[PDB]
Amino acid sequence: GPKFPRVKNWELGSITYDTLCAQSQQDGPCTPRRCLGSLVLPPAEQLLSQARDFINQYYSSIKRSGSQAHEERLQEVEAEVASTGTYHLRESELVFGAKQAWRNAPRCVGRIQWGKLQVFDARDCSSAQEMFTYICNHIKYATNRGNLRSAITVFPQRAPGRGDFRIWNSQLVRYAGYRQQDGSVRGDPANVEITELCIQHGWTPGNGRFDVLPLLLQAPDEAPELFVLPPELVLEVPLEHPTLEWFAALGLRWYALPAVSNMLLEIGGLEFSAAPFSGWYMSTEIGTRNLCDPHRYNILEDVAVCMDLDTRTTSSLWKDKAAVEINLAVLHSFQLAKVTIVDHHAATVSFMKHLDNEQKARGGCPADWAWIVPPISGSLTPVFHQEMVNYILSPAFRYQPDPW
Amino acid sequence: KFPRVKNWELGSITYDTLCAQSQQDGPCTPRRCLGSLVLPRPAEQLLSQARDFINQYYSSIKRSGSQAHEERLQEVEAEVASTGTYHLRESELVFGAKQAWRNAPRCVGRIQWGKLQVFDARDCSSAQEMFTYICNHIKYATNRGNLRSAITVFPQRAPGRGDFRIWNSQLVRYAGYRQQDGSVRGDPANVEITELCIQHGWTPGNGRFDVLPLLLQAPDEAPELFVLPPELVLEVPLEHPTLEWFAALGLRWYALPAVSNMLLEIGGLEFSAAPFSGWYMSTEIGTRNLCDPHRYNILEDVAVCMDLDTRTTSSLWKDKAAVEINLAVLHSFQLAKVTIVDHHAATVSFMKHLDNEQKARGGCPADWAWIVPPISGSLTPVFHQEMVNYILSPAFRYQPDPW
Ligand code: HEM
Ligand code: HEM
Ligand SMILES: Cc1cc(N)nc(CCc2cncc(CCc3cc(C)nc(N)c3)c2)c1
Ligand SMILES: Cc1cc(N)nc(CCc2cncc(CCc3cc(C)nc(N)c3)c2)c1
Ligand SMILES: C[C@H](O)[C@H](O)[C@H]1CNc2nc(N)[nH]c(=O)c2N1
Ligand SMILES: C[C@H](O)[C@H](O)[C@H]1CNc2nc(N)[nH]c(=O)c2N1
Ligand SMILES: [Zn+2]
């Protein structure tokens, strides 16, 4: 009947219809001819319509839709655009947009927490040194000695004919990856390029597998400046296994704070090129992807050898067994150290609760199935059996190309 | 126009040009992706699908634009112009069947696509005859545990009349008996088909692993019930390589995965009954069939036997039991000398298939959500591989349940 996508859960037999997708003003990469769902990378008039839409979202969310203050704010926005080509958000408009951008993020499984975000307003920042102060404050607040708190710091928006604020690092905490004489990599192969950029800009590098990178921070029309994070600020967790005693001997570790720093936060047509945001980890991020991806730390074989598994044949499931233990090491070590973490079962249960909340509140929830389903034990989690509709809503976080 | 397709593990890139051959729209639009949805929500027409297919066939035998190609195009035209339909030659049917498998985006086993035994059952005129054909197929495919891909093709759909149909979703399925207490003994996925069998006269067993009888339907007739001779249905008792108590769970599975409810479309003609079989990938049994909450749902039972801490999600007791259940499937099939493939071997060979199809055809339609296995996703190479999904013809299609 209903003229909207029907959405089914195949575990429970239950059906909903996504009406929220009607609100989408931006096209994805799919067409009736072909689905491109699995691809990782997909003027005054334009801005004004995006701005009007954002302001309407803001006044709806406070239930003052159509009211005098709403119409006056609309008028204020177009007058400002009419005379400068841009406009500026009020403090509470920014807080709302930031939460909404997180709420709208299709690839994030942690969205049950969306209303609980500390928005640090840093739109007064005017130097790379001050970005560093702001960032250090973010890290201290967010880390909270292991009791992690979601946060985002917002630096000044893109301006006509003026350079961007950029953090060059993809996260505020990353391990160095050192290209070796034998072609191999010591540390994190993901970070080879950023490591080499740091050295070029005068960083004296280490030679470990877990050297915390410095930050490369760029203020408008300036070369980026290098800043070392004081080690007492970067909380890390040494990895041990609850029953396999040798696991600690591997000297594996990971940091507490997952903090994305290279994404663009778009709100009502305004673009915040530097707006680092953080939460807490889902255990599979560390245990499965970071430690077991072949193009990352690639430790599966080492761990299976320690576990004395038959690594010569696929059908011993040595890969699956070792990956489980590594993931269990991640959970146990964070729990022991009292650093917030969530396992993939609890995270996905909570995402299902979030889907239900959003069905009631907005009549849908944009979600990217391939990213929501965890990289181990997929169908053991409830999200695997849940159909999802993926579409772009604004405010949004958006990928941006590296500035170098 | 042509999408770039990247492997994120290796950094390699291709471009899919094959997708331009799609003539059938899927469920997505620029406004929203519906790629995760399980189901989709005239003379000149048939003639053009028929032409294109015949063109595909003569192309495949490198006789494109020859005399035989010309005269065959004319036969099809002449037949459609007079009767509103036409008929395939056996070799064309064989080609079209292999192509529908090749073109199937949810299938991880497509490296095998050229190795398919095709039984022509288009001279079938009764449920009885359907049954004999089905028994031949099973015996052939099973081959004492050395499984061989096969398909049997029953008579095409005709505008005048009802369809030949196999009511069962697979040739071999375990019954699900709805109990007094609303629980299900056996397989919850097969409650409805079990009740239909009983209603049409089947005396039911009471076990967890009772092989269902077949309900076969010839055009515009009530379906008929046929019991498969137990000697034809190969089964594998499940035991564990080290965990001695597992064998006592009394668990088992059938050797032969044989889809019997899909429609095969070739050159515009529709084959409403066309059962096909290969061999299992171990996650289908070990993860989905035994571990789904709405299936046999044995996870907790296994975890408790393993004496795991089931009180909390963070002990990863589900992940651990799931791995052992999969191991037990692999080991038991190996022990019983019945063909099986694990999810690492299958996805590695699927990657090879992708490369083969890239050179052969300029692409390969693939549904990522179905190609990536249900456990240990990112541990297989397919996780890190971008995929383009689209509908090519010949094709297997979903069709409504006949009741
Ligand atoms: C509160 C705890 C959180 C958890 C457990 C969580 C979980 C996750 C996970 C597992 C992913 C996929 C990441 C990957 O596989 O690389 C993700 C993606 C994402 N999340 Fe969260 N998240 C949390 C908080 C946040 C916050 C605070 C924000 C921003 C305000 C956010 C926004 C995003 C965005 C934009 C993506 C997509 C990133 C990309 O495409 O690179 N999440 N989340
Ligand atoms: C040779 C061994 C084969 C293996 C290991 C294999 C593997 C698989 C797997 C794991 C699936 C997904 C099943 C699920 O999750 O329900 C699948 C789907 C499928 N396969 Fe295969 N396959 C094989 C042979 C075949 C053959 C012989 C055909 C037809 C001639 C075929 C056509 C299909 C089709 C049409 C689907 C999608 C069915 C649906 O949407 O329900 N495959 N395959
Ligand atoms: C706030 C937050 C919390 C959390 N638990 N995880 C994250 C994920 C961070 C993360 C880690 N590794 C990789 C990525 C993906 C980076 C990335 C790369 C490309 C090519 N396209 C994208 N859209 C995104 C993101 C963020
Ligand atoms: C030939 C073959 C070989 C193999 N190894 N596995 C299979 C899996 C068959 C199979 C088993 N259970 C369930 C399904 C899916 C059934 C199915 C159900 C619905 C609602 N829509 C669809 N498109 C498909 C398929 C087939
Ligand atoms: C090719 C595929 O789109 C890609 O590997 C995706 C799949 N799903 C993912 N899901 C999450 N959460 N994170 C990822 O990096 C990926 N990678
Ligand atoms: C909703 C979701 O698309 C659905 O659960 C799919 C996911 N991937 C799958 N993949 C395979 N191979 N088989 C399946 O049944 C499913 N189920
Ligand atoms: Zn799509």
Side-chain angles (χ1 to χ4, degrees):
Chain A
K3 288 137 87 290
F4 300 97
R6 167 210 254 236
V7 184
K8 172 161 174 173
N9 180 299
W10 288 83
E11 178 193 337
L12 299 173
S14 57
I15 306 303
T16 73
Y17 291 87
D18 189 310
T19 52
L20 175 64
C21 63
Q23 289 318 290
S24 182
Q25 296 292 171
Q26 200 162 339
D27 292 347
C30 296
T31 67
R33 275 191 159 96
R34 78 289 181 286
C35 179
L36 253 29
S38 75
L39 301 210
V40 179
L41 286 192
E45 69 209 306
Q46 190 53 37
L47 189 163
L48 213 57
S49 62
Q50 282 176 262
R52 281 190 248 97
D53 172 273
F54 172 69
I55 298 296
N56 295 346
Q57 291 187 55
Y58 179 72
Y59 283 85
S60 294
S61 77
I62 61 160
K63 311 304 162 52
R64 300 292 178 259
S65 219
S67 76
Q68 184 165 297
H70 177 198
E71 308 283 313
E72 285 181 8
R73 183 64 182 133
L74 286 175
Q75 284 187 172
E76 185 172 58
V77 165
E78 39 209 44
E80 204 183 335
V81 171
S83 70
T84 72
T86 190
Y87 74 113
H88 292 278
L89 307 173
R90 305 220 258 237
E91 161 193 278
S92 74
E93 293 173 356
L94 181 60
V95 175
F96 170 76
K99 293 171 168 170
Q100 208 67 3
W102 180 15
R103 191 193 195 171
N104 292 337
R107 293 177 169 166
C108 179
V109 75
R111 282 176 286 169
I112 202 179
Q113 289 295 140
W114 80 264
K116 222 285 187 75
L117 177 68
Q118 193 59 41
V119 179
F120 295 112
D121 197 330
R123 299 176 292 163
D124 58 351
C125 188
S126 69
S127 82
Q129 175 58 67
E130 196 181 2
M131 301 181 60
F132 183 58
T133 308
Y134 270 114
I135 287 158
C136 284
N137 288 344
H138 182 119
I139 291 166
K140 285 184 286 188
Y141 180 91
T143 310
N144 192 33
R145 284 193 319 270
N147 184 2
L148 276 45
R149 300 181 285 204
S150 297
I152 182 164
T153 295
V154 183
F155 295 101
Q157 63 200 55
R158 282 217 180 123
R162 195 262 275 127
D164 288 350
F165 285 83
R166 291 291 322 251
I167 301 161
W168 282 32
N169 311 57
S170 70
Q171 296 187 28
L172 302 177
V173 186
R174 298 266 65 193
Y175 294 127
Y178 307 114
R179 190 154 276 318
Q180 302 297 293
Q181 185 79 355
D182 40 288
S184 74
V185 183
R186 191 155 173 76
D188 191 343
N191 301 321
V192 155
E193 224 200 333
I194 190 64
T195 303
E196 279 156 5
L197 283 168
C198 287
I199 300 166
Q200 262 173 212
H201 285 86
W203 182 52
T204 307
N207 66 345
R209 309 172 76 185
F210 302 104
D211 297 337
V212 179
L213 279 166
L215 267 18
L216 230 12
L217 304 180
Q218 174 169 55
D221 309 291
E222 282 185 357
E225 289 166 38
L226 193 67
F227 298 91
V228 183
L229 290 158
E232 61 269 32
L233 262 57
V234 183
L235 183 64
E236 290 176 274
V237 183
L239 298 185
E240 65 167 51
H241 186 282
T243 50
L244 296 171
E245 299 196 303
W246 45 260
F247 194 100
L250 271 22
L252 304 167
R253 59 207 268 120
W254 208 258
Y255 51 92
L257 190 72
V260 176
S261 56
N262 65 164
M263 292 197 86
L264 184 136
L265 160 77
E266 180 268 330
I267 303 173
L270 307 173
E271 295 175 302
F272 300 82
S273 59
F277 59 85
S278 65
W280 56 79
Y281 270 113
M282 180 167 77
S283 60
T284 55
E285 290 176 274
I286 308 176
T288 308
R289 307 295 316 285
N290 299 350
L291 298 176
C292 303
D293 274 0
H295 50 295
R296 297 296 293 289
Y297 279 87
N298 194 208
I299 74 170
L300 232 28
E301 218 190 22
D302 291 334
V303 168
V305 166
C306 296
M307 286 180 66
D308 199 59
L309 301 176
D310 186 351
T311 64
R312 290 184 316 235
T313 180
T314 54
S315 70
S316 68
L317 305 195
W318 59 272
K319 281 182 167 167
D320 315 71
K321 285 174 148 169
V324 166
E325 300 309 339
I326 298 163
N327 278 266
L328 182 66
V330 173
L331 280 155
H332 161 83
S333 306
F334 274 66
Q335 279 162 180
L336 190 88
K338 292 139 129 49
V339 178
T340 311
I341 192 148
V342 63
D343 72 76
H344 50 294
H345 306 284
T348 56
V349 163
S350 85
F351 183 77
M352 294 302 290
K353 177 55 183 180
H354 170 78
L355 291 173
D356 189 48
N357 292 346
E358 292 288 81
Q359 196 60 39
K360 290 190 256 277
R362 297 210 285 185
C365 176
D368 185 339
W369 188 98
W371 281 66
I372 295 294
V373 170
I376 50 169
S377 296
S379 69
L380 279 25
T381 73
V383 290
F384 182 100
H385 311 279
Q386 175 64 62
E387 293 175 340
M388 296 178 197
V389 189
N390 194 195
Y391 46 94
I392 303 164
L393 303 169
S394 173
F397 295 107
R398 200 204 288 158
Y399 219 63
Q400 50 182 350
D402 297 330
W404 57 86
Chain B
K1 209 166 290 267
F2 304 111
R4 171 174 148 298
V5 185
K6 170 155 171 182
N7 184 294
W8 283 85
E9 169 188 351
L10 294 166
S12 58
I13 280 147
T14 64
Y15 289 98
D16 185 311
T17 54
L18 181 60
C19 71
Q21 305 300 302
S22 187
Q23 304 272 55
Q24 262 256 276
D25 295 338
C28 302
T29 68
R31 152 170 282 110
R32 78 289 179 284
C33 179
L34 256 13
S36 79
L37 293 236
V38 175
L39 291 181
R41 249 200 136 176
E44 342 270 288
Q45 166 78 170
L46 169 74
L47 193 61
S48 84
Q49 285 168 269
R51 292 187 104 267
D52 174 80
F53 170 77
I54 294 288
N55 288 352
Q56 282 188 51
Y57 176 82
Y58 278 90
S59 216
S60 85
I61 66 162
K62 294 273 130 65
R63 293 293 168 275
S64 216
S66 60
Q67 94 288 221
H69 181 198
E70 283 312 307
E71 297 169 357
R72 178 61 185 145
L73 282 173
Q74 283 163 24
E75 283 176 1
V76 167
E77 294 242 342
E79 209 177 320
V80 169
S82 286
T83 71
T85 195
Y86 75 113
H87 297 82
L88 308 166
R89 310 304 184 230
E90 178 167 15
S91 58
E92 293 163 0
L93 180 66
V94 165
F95 168 74
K98 283 164 186 179
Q99 219 56 24
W101 179 13
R102 190 195 195 169
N103 291 334
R106 296 173 163 177
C107 182
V108 73
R110 285 180 275 168
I111 203 162
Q112 288 295 146
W113 76 266
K115 194 148 192 284
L116 181 67
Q117 185 61 32
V118 177
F119 296 101
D120 183 1
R122 291 174 294 166
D123 72 324
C124 186
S125 63
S126 76
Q128 246 307 331
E129 293 181 341
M130 292 182 75
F131 179 59
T132 305
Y133 276 110
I134 284 171
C135 289
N136 160 90
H137 178 132
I138 292 162
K139 152 261 173 267
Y140 179 85
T142 309
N143 185 213
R144 262 98 101 283
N146 188 189
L147 276 44
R148 288 183 287 195
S149 300
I151 188 179
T152 301
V153 186
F154 292 105
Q156 65 205 58
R157 313 232 286 148
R161 55 128 172 95
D163 294 336
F164 284 87
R165 285 297 299 265
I166 298 150
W167 279 33
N168 309 53
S169 72
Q170 301 181 18
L171 296 183
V172 190
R173 294 255 72 183
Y174 296 133
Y177 313 109
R178 226 178 212 154
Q179 302 288 290
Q180 164 105 341
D181 22 295
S183 68
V184 178
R185 189 149 180 77
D187 188 347
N190 304 318
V191 158
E192 200 190 2
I193 184 70
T194 302
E195 273 152 5
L196 284 171
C197 288
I198 298 170
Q199 173 202 112
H200 289 85
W202 183 54
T203 306
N206 56 26
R208 285 184 80 183
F209 300 103
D210 296 332
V211 179
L212 273 169
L214 302 167
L215 272 154
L216 307 176
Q217 169 179 56
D220 302 308
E221 295 294 316
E224 282 181 67
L225 195 77
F226 303 89
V227 182
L228 296 163
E231 66 267 39
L232 277 190
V233 176
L234 183 57
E235 288 183 273
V236 179
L238 305 189
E239 63 156 58
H240 195 274
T242 54
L243 302 176
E244 216 198 318
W245 48 255
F246 196 102
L249 297 179
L251 268 13
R252 62 209 269 125
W253 209 258
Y254 52 87
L256 187 61
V259 168
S260 56
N261 68 171
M262 291 190 88
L263 177 154
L264 164 72
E265 179 272 315
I266 297 176
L269 295 176
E270 299 181 325
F271 301 88
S272 58
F276 56 89
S277 61
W279 54 79
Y280 268 117
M281 176 167 81
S282 54
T283 50
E284 299 178 80
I285 306 163
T287 304
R288 302 296 317 291
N289 297 352
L290 297 171
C291 295
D292 278 354
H294 51 303
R295 301 291 306 281
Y296 281 85
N297 189 226
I298 64 166
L299 222 34
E300 199 193 300
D301 277 344
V302 176
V304 165
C305 299
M306 291 179 61
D307 188 48
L308 302 173
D309 184 354
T310 288
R311 300 182 313 237
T312 170
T313 56
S314 47
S315 71
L316 297 193
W317 65 266
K318 291 196 187 199
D319 313 73
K320 277 186 186 180
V323 173
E324 300 311 316
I325 291 148
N326 284 79
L327 192 66
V329 174
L330 277 161
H331 165 81
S332 310
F333 271 63
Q334 279 153 2
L335 193 74
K337 296 296 173 46
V338 178
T339 314
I340 190 97
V341 65
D342 69 71
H343 52 287
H344 308 287
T347 52
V348 160
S349 101
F350 189 70
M351 295 301 298
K352 171 59 172 172
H353 175 74
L354 286 183
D355 187 72
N356 287 353
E357 288 289 85
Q358 196 62 38
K359 294 160 200 197
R361 281 213 294 187
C364 174
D367 182 339
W368 189 97
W370 282 62
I371 300 294
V372 177
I375 53 166
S376 298
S378 72
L379 270 40
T380 70
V382 295
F383 187 91
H384 312 278
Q385 179 59 62
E386 287 174 357
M387 301 174 196
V388 185
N389 193 11
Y390 44 97
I391 297 159
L392 300 179
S393 187
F396 288 106
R397 295 208 323 253
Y398 211 77
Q399 56 182 348
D401 283 339
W403 61 88

